[PDB]
Design a protein around this motif. Structure first.
Motif, mmCIF file in Angstrom:
data_model
loop_
_atom_site.group_PDB
_atom_site.id
_atom_site.type_symbol
_atom_site.label_atom_id
_atom_site.label_comp_id
_atom_site.label_asym_id
_atom_site.label_seq_id
_atom_site.Cartn_x
_atom_site.Cartn_y
_atom_site.Cartn_z
ATOM 1 N N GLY A 108 -9.390 27.537 39.209
ATOM 2 C CA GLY A 108 -8.030 27.398 39.702
ATOM 3 C C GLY A 108 -7.381 26.105 39.255
ATOM 4 N N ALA A 109 -8.151 25.017 39.235
ATOM 5 C CA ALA A 109 -7.626 23.756 38.721
ATOM 6 C C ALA A 109 -7.261 23.877 37.247
ATOM 7 C CB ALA A 109 -8.642 22.635 38.931
ATOM 8 N N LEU A 110 -8.107 24.549 36.462
ATOM 9 C CA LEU A 110 -7.797 24.765 35.052
ATOM 10 C C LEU A 110 -6.538 25.608 34.883
ATOM 11 C CD1 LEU A 110 -8.530 24.771 31.985
ATOM 12 C CD2 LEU A 110 -9.853 26.836 32.466
ATOM 13 N N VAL A 111 -6.401 26.666 35.685
ATOM 14 C CA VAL A 111 -5.226 27.528 35.596
ATOM 15 C C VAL A 111 -3.969 26.746 35.943
ATOM 16 C CG1 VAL A 111 -4.055 29.404 36.785
ATOM 17 C CG2 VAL A 111 -6.339 29.757 35.868
ATOM 18 N N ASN A 112 -4.031 25.932 36.999
ATOM 19 C CA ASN A 112 -2.874 25.129 37.378
ATOM 20 C C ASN A 112 -2.539 24.099 36.308
ATOM 21 O OD1 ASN A 112 -1.376 25.677 39.803
ATOM 22 N ND2 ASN A 112 -3.273 25.361 40.960
ATOM 23 N N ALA A 113 -3.555 23.497 35.685
ATOM 24 C CA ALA A 113 -3.296 22.531 34.621
ATOM 25 C C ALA A 113 -2.632 23.189 33.418
ATOM 26 C CB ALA A 113 -4.594 21.844 34.207
ATOM 27 N N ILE A 114 -3.103 24.374 33.024
ATOM 28 C CA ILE A 114 -2.488 25.068 31.895
ATOM 29 C C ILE A 114 -1.068 25.501 32.242
ATOM 30 C CG2 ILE A 114 -2.650 27.056 30.376
ATOM 31 C CD1 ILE A 114 -5.740 26.864 30.845
ATOM 32 N N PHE A 115 -0.850 25.949 33.480
ATOM 33 C CA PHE A 115 0.497 26.303 33.910
ATOM 34 C C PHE A 115 1.419 25.091 33.878
ATOM 35 C CE2 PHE A 115 3.375 27.961 37.449
ATOM 36 C CZ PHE A 115 4.122 28.696 36.556
ATOM 37 N N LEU A 116 0.919 23.933 34.312
ATOM 38 C CA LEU A 116 1.716 22.713 34.264
ATOM 39 C C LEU A 116 2.030 22.315 32.829
ATOM 40 C CD1 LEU A 116 3.080 20.331 35.544
ATOM 41 C CD2 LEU A 116 0.865 19.187 35.708
ATOM 42 N N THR A 117 1.059 22.455 31.925
ATOM 43 C CA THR A 117 1.310 22.143 30.520
ATOM 44 C C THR A 117 2.364 23.071 29.927
ATOM 45 O OG1 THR A 117 -0.903 21.227 30.198
ATOM 46 C CG2 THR A 117 0.268 21.997 28.249
ATOM 47 N N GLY A 118 2.286 24.364 30.246
ATOM 48 C CA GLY A 118 3.306 25.289 29.780
ATOM 49 C C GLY A 118 4.680 24.963 30.331
ATOM 50 N N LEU A 119 4.749 24.605 31.615
ATOM 51 C CA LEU A 119 6.021 24.202 32.204
ATOM 52 C C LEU A 119 6.556 22.939 31.541
ATOM 53 C CD1 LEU A 119 5.803 24.910 36.034
ATOM 54 C CD2 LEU A 119 6.706 26.308 34.170
ATOM 55 N N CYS A 120 5.666 21.999 31.215
ATOM 56 C CA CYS A 120 6.081 20.779 30.532
ATOM 57 C C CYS A 120 6.651 21.083 29.154
ATOM 58 C CB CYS A 120 4.896 19.822 30.417
ATOM 59 S SG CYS A 120 4.589 18.841 31.894
ATOM 60 N N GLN B 188 -11.602 18.596 45.220
ATOM 61 C CA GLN B 188 -10.593 17.602 44.878
ATOM 62 C C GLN B 188 -9.880 17.933 43.573
ATOM 63 O OE1 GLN B 188 -12.783 13.928 44.876
ATOM 64 N NE2 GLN B 188 -13.286 14.072 47.059
ATOM 65 N N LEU B 189 -10.547 18.640 42.657
ATOM 66 C CA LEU B 189 -9.907 19.006 41.396
ATOM 67 C C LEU B 189 -8.710 19.917 41.635
ATOM 68 C CD1 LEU B 189 -12.735 19.526 38.756
ATOM 69 C CD2 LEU B 189 -10.693 18.100 38.538
ATOM 70 N N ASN B 190 -8.877 20.924 42.492
ATOM 71 C CA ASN B 190 -7.749 21.768 42.863
ATOM 72 C C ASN B 190 -6.680 20.959 43.584
ATOM 73 O OD1 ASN B 190 -6.167 24.023 43.254
ATOM 74 N ND2 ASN B 190 -7.311 24.725 45.052
ATOM 75 N N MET B 191 -7.102 20.055 44.471
ATOM 76 C CA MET B 191 -6.150 19.197 45.166
ATOM 77 C C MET B 191 -5.382 18.323 44.184
ATOM 78 S SD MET B 191 -6.152 15.661 46.199
ATOM 79 C CE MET B 191 -7.471 14.997 47.210
ATOM 80 N N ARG B 192 -6.074 17.751 43.196
ATOM 81 C CA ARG B 192 -5.394 16.919 42.210
ATOM 82 C C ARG B 192 -4.444 17.745 41.351
ATOM 83 N NH1 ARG B 192 -5.141 11.447 42.555
ATOM 84 N NH2 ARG B 192 -7.209 11.793 43.472
ATOM 85 N N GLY B 193 -4.827 18.978 41.020
ATOM 86 C CA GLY B 193 -3.931 19.838 40.262
ATOM 87 C C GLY B 193 -2.659 20.159 41.022
ATOM 88 N N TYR C 235 -3.348 15.397 31.263
ATOM 89 C CA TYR C 235 -4.409 15.539 30.268
ATOM 90 C C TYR C 235 -5.803 15.310 30.842
ATOM 91 C CZ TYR C 235 -7.355 14.615 26.238
ATOM 92 O OH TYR C 235 -8.384 14.616 25.326
ATOM 93 N N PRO C 236 -6.071 14.259 31.632
ATOM 94 C CA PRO C 236 -7.445 14.083 32.139
ATOM 95 C C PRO C 236 -7.949 15.247 32.976
ATOM 96 C CG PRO C 236 -6.203 12.063 32.381
ATOM 97 C CD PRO C 236 -5.214 13.122 32.011
ATOM 98 N N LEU C 237 -7.110 15.808 33.848
ATOM 99 C CA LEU C 237 -7.553 16.916 34.688
ATOM 100 C C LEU C 237 -7.851 18.156 33.855
ATOM 101 C CD1 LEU C 237 -6.007 17.877 38.086
ATOM 102 C CD2 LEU C 237 -6.486 19.646 36.434
ATOM 103 N N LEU C 238 -6.967 18.479 32.911
ATOM 104 C CA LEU C 238 -7.194 19.626 32.042
ATOM 105 C C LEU C 238 -8.460 19.443 31.220
ATOM 106 C CD1 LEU C 238 -6.378 22.208 30.483
ATOM 107 C CD2 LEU C 238 -4.928 20.753 29.069
ATOM 108 N N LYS C 239 -8.670 18.235 30.692
ATOM 109 C CA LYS C 239 -9.874 17.959 29.919
ATOM 110 C C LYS C 239 -11.128 18.104 30.772
ATOM 111 C CE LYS C 239 -12.168 13.632 28.642
ATOM 112 N NZ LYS C 239 -12.413 13.203 30.045
#
Ligand SMILES: CCCCCCCCCCC(CCCCCCCCCC)(CO[C@@H]1O[C@H](CO)[C@@H](O[C@H]2O[C@H](CO)[C@@H](O)[C@H](O)[C@H]2O)[C@H](O)[C@H]1O)CO[C@@H]1O[C@H](CO)[C@@H](O[C@H]2O[C@H](CO)[C@@H](O)[C@H](O)[C@H]2O)[C@H](O)[C@H]1O
Ligand SMILES: CCCCCCCCCCC(CCCCCCCCCC)(CO[C@@H]1O[C@H](CO)[C@@H](O[C@H]2O[C@H](CO)[C@@H](O)[C@H](O)[C@H]2O)[C@H](O)[C@H]1O)CO[C@@H]1O[C@H](CO)[C@@H](O[C@H]2O[C@H](CO)[C@@H](O)[C@H](O)[C@H]2O)[C@H](O)[C@H]1O
Ligand SMILES: CC(C)CCC[C@@H](C)[C@H]1CC[C@H]2[C@@H]3CC=C4C[C@@H](OC(=O)CCC(=O)O)CC[C@]4(C)[C@H]3CC[C@]12C
Ligand SMILES: CC(C)CCC[C@@H](C)[C@H]1CC[C@H]2[C@@H]3CC=C4C[C@@H](OC(=O)CCC(=O)O)CC[C@]4(C)[C@H]3CC[C@]12C
Ligand SMILES: CC(C)CCC[C@@H](C)[C@H]1CC[C@H]2[C@@H]3CC=C4C[C@@H](OC(=O)CCC(=O)O)CC[C@]4(C)[C@H]3CC[C@]12C
Ligand SMILES: CC(C)CCC[C@@H](C)[C@H]1CC[C@H]2[C@@H]3CC=C4C[C@@H](OC(=O)CCC(=O)O)CC[C@]4(C)[C@H]3CC[C@]12C
Ligand SMILES: CC(C)CCC[C@@H](C)[C@H]1CC[C@H]2[C@@H]3CC=C4C[C@@H](OC(=O)CCC(=O)O)CC[C@]4(C)[C@H]3CC[C@]12C
Ligand SMILES: [Zn+2]
Ligand SMILES: [Zn+2]
Ligand SMILES: [Zn+2]
Ligand SMILES: [Zn+2]
Ligand SMILES: [Zn+2]
Ligand SMILES: [Zn+2]
Lengths: 322, 323
Positions: B76-88, B136-141, B215-219
């Motif tokens: 879920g954290a990865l999905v949210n990070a990719i969604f955020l990158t796409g939105l960016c 915490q990864l999901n929370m950080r995302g 970038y750090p969270l996605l990585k």
């Protein structure tokens, strides 16, 4: 030759983007300028596919990844699927806005020509990508190209209808319809069935893309999560594992796959006496054979007080495996 | 807890969507309703986080997942990070579009008020979300996703304030029109042109900061799902320490990977000399694995040369074995 097809499609995307920019500059149309940058998403999808393919070319143990980058292709497929879903939601929001705020296209002929060029590019891309592990990445790229092809079909049909079933005004003539807003508050020749033809076609394309994308996203997520492949039954594997001479307890059976057919298994066995373990080990490996398991790591625990004796001191941290 | 925070943020997001919808209805500013529909991105992000949190607690083994769904949070954290990158990337594309052609805002007052309300809502969200690593990864995302729209709201507020204070309007038919913006139907803006390009530059800076912080969270999420050995575990040193025990002469396939948070699983093949007194060295290898962050191990002793591993399939297919 997966890299060749990706490179050819990427080069074609660059050439068509340059052609669109040149057409926009020569005709001084801002809509074509806006649409030129829309294929940066396709370029990004192709770059992600290329990076995944290149990193999956190497499969060697490393100080950074013991398994290597075998799971690069499935990660690329998952990334492409998520990107495609995000693009589908974005264009669905754009379709909703078009429903709320209809627009009128300018120069239907040049739009139709650009759409025809895009349709030829997309159909030849499908011809390259119809697949004449690594298939999931190719499947995701093919789904993206098919979405682009459906968009091209939509724009071609919209331009054709707007040129054959519409009649606007080239000057200050009396044809204003209050359905579309006018600047500063400003007849039956042009019906309203055409302005709403693009949004409904876009919604249909979104539905088709989501329908054909959901299985790919599901499979990529199931691979990335540690899920037993659908061709392997855990109950049958346990039944055949307990029906083995010399072994009575089989705990800690973790089964998962890395990518493609690289299915990895791991279990603990209470293999009676230590001396005759080797004969049982070959039978266990054979038993894994009847199923789909090959990567194995079987722990022969020897000696009902405790299920697993080789456990750590405190596992309350829940730092284990299951 | 964590689920309650997600439900509270979802409720606040729905309330703000209702607020913007009714404001658009009573004002006829369709851009406000468009932004209300855009808030479906936040709704989707919170829904994804909620599903991940709900399914991560099913730690028990399943007929479909022997490891369980404890990998759901990191996914879920990865999905949210990719969604955020796409939105960016979408935001950056919109900024480039605004460079291509700008727009004139209809009424700075109502949009400024909506931006202030959004800023307060997003500040409440940031206060909620600032305070296992996988949880915490999901929370950080979700925190990054909230911060992105907080920065967007700040940009909207700043642009509205500057546009109202430092720009000259042109509504009635007069000579105030300038070709800086396209003139419908083929038609002196005493307001500086510096304001027409205040949304795009600020959005570019915001997307730069957002990409830098995401970038750090996605990585990290991508590394976790790629079976990367954790950064706190050294493979070479662990091999050297394992080969130092008396009962083991050679170790091959030290497959070490991180499942979620502080769950590291290591499977190794060792070659023990004799089955007699084998359990003496099993305790030693378990202890030496513990000496690091690896607590869930599985070792296969091989009693026996030319072949690297005495147990293998009949074909030794390179496309079906690990590594
Ligand atoms: C969408 C697809 C996603 C999956 C595919 C990509 C997965 C990640 C790939 C792993 C990755 C990034 C990890 C962090 C970002 C992750 C972002 C994930 C985002 C997901 C959405 C690990 O990162 C590297 O790992 C190395 C090993 O630990 C190490 O550096 C090591 O290399 C330093 C080189 O300068 C060096 O200085 C240092 O001394 C090394 O120790 C460092 O940790 C780091 O540099 C990058 O791959 C690594 O770097 C190179 C790549 O081509 C590749 O180098 C080779 O070719 C080079 C030719 O020019 C040239 O250098 C050499 O010929 C050779 O070295 C490496 O072989 C590869 O392993
Ligand atoms: C961003 C990160 C998100 C990560 C999400 C990770 C979790 C995914 C959860 C979904 C998933 C994993 C597969 C992945 C699907 C795609 C996932 C998304 C992919 C893209 C990211 C498991 O989850 C299922 O969900 C159920 C509903 O919540 C729930 O069952 C609840 O029941 C009670 C009532 O609610 C509740 O009282 C109880 O307490 C729960 O047990 C269980 O968790 C489980 O059965 C679905 O798997 C399977 O899907 C099948 C239908 O295809 C379907 O199978 C059924 O088949 C027969 C009937 O056809 C039936 O006879 C079988 O018995 C049954 O098996 C099931 O659905 C599931 O077996
Ligand atoms: C672009 C990114 C940000 C989002 C990607 C889309 C997600 C919002 C979707 C993709 C797959 C979906 C999941 C697919 C399958 C299921 C199982 C489903 O479980 C059932 O209802 C099973 C049947 C039953 O119990 O009756 C619950 C929703 C869920 C978790 C879905 C939740 C929403 C998900 C994660
Ligand atoms: C509800 C909102 C969030 C929109 C979700 C996506 C939609 C565009 C719908 C419209 C048609 C739906 C699809 C129609 C039927 C199926 C059944 C199933 O796939 C099959 O077709 C298998 C056979 C079967 O139909 O049962 C999995 C979900 C899927 C693809 C659906 C996924 C969601 C889709 C694409
Ligand atoms: C691509 C993104 C936008 C996700 C689109 C789909 C999702 C909105 C998820 C959420 C809940 C899911 C549904 C939850 C439960 C079921 C029942 C499930 O029933 C069966 O397994 C019947 C047999 C069969 O699959 O053919 C089929 C999939 C379906 C419709 C799921 C289809 C996919 C859904 C609609
Ligand atoms: C579809 C989109 C939304 C997905 C997310 C963005 C990706 C296009 C980005 C995010 C992180 C990027 C990666 C971050 C780090 C690297 C390492 C880089 O290699 C190095 O720098 C290693 C040293 C060397 O230069 O040789 C190669 C590109 C790559 C894989 C990048 C490829 C492009 C990635 C996957
Ligand atoms: C390509 C277009 C469309 C957008 C460009 C946006 C840039 C302004 C962003 C995108 C990714 C960002 C980079 C993502 C990651 C890093 C690593 C970060 O720290 C490191 O150099 C190493 C960190 C580590 O090893 O953990 C320094 C900022 C930097 C270069 C960022 C600088 C700003 C970048 C290039
Ligand atoms: Zn055991
Ligand atoms: Zn376990
Ligand atoms: Zn071995
Ligand atoms: Zn321990
Ligand atoms: Zn075999
Ligand atoms: Zn191996």
């Amino acid at each position: 030759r997966n890299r060749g097809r990706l490179l050819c499609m990427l080069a074609l995307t660059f050439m068509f983007m340059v052609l669109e920019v040149v057409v926009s500059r020569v005709t001084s149309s801002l809509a074509m300028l806006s649409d030129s940058f829309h294929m940066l998403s396709d370029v990004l999808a192709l770059v992600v596919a290329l990076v995944a393919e290149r990193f999956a070319r190497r499969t060697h143990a490393t100080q950074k990844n013991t398994f290597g980058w075998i799971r690069a292709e499935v990660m690329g497929a998952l990334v492409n699927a998520i990107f495609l879903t995000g693009l589908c939601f974005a264009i669905l929001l754009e379709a909703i806005e078009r429903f709320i705020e209809p627009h009128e296209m300018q120069q239907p002929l040049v739009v139709l020509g650009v759409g025809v060029a895009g349709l030829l590019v997309n159909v030849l891309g499908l011809c390259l990508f119809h697949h004449h592990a690594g298939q999931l990445n190719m499947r995701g790229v093919f789904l993206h190209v098919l979405g682009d092809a459906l968009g091209s079909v939509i724009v071609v049909v919209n331009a054709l209808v707007f040129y054959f079933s519409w009649k606007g005004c080239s000057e200050g003539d009396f044809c204003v319809n209050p359905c579309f807003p006018d600047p500063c508050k400003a007849y039956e020749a042009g019906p309203c069935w055409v302005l709403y033809l693009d949004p409904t076609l876009c919604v249909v394309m979104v539905c088709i893309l989501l329908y054909t994308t959901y299985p790919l996203l599901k499979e990529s997520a199931l691979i990335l999560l540690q899920t037993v492949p659908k061709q392997i039954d855990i109950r049958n594997l346990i039944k055949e594992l307990r029906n083995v001479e010399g072994v009575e307890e089989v705990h800690e059976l973790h089964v998962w796959q890395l990518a493609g057919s690289r299915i990895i298994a791991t279990a603990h066995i209470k293999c009676e006496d230590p001396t005759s373990y080797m004969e049982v080990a070959k039978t266990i490996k054979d038993v894994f054979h009847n199923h789909g398991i090959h990567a194995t790591t079987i722990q022969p625990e020897f000696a009902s007080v405790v299920p697993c004796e080789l456990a750590c001191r405190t596992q309350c941290a829940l730092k284990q495996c299951c």
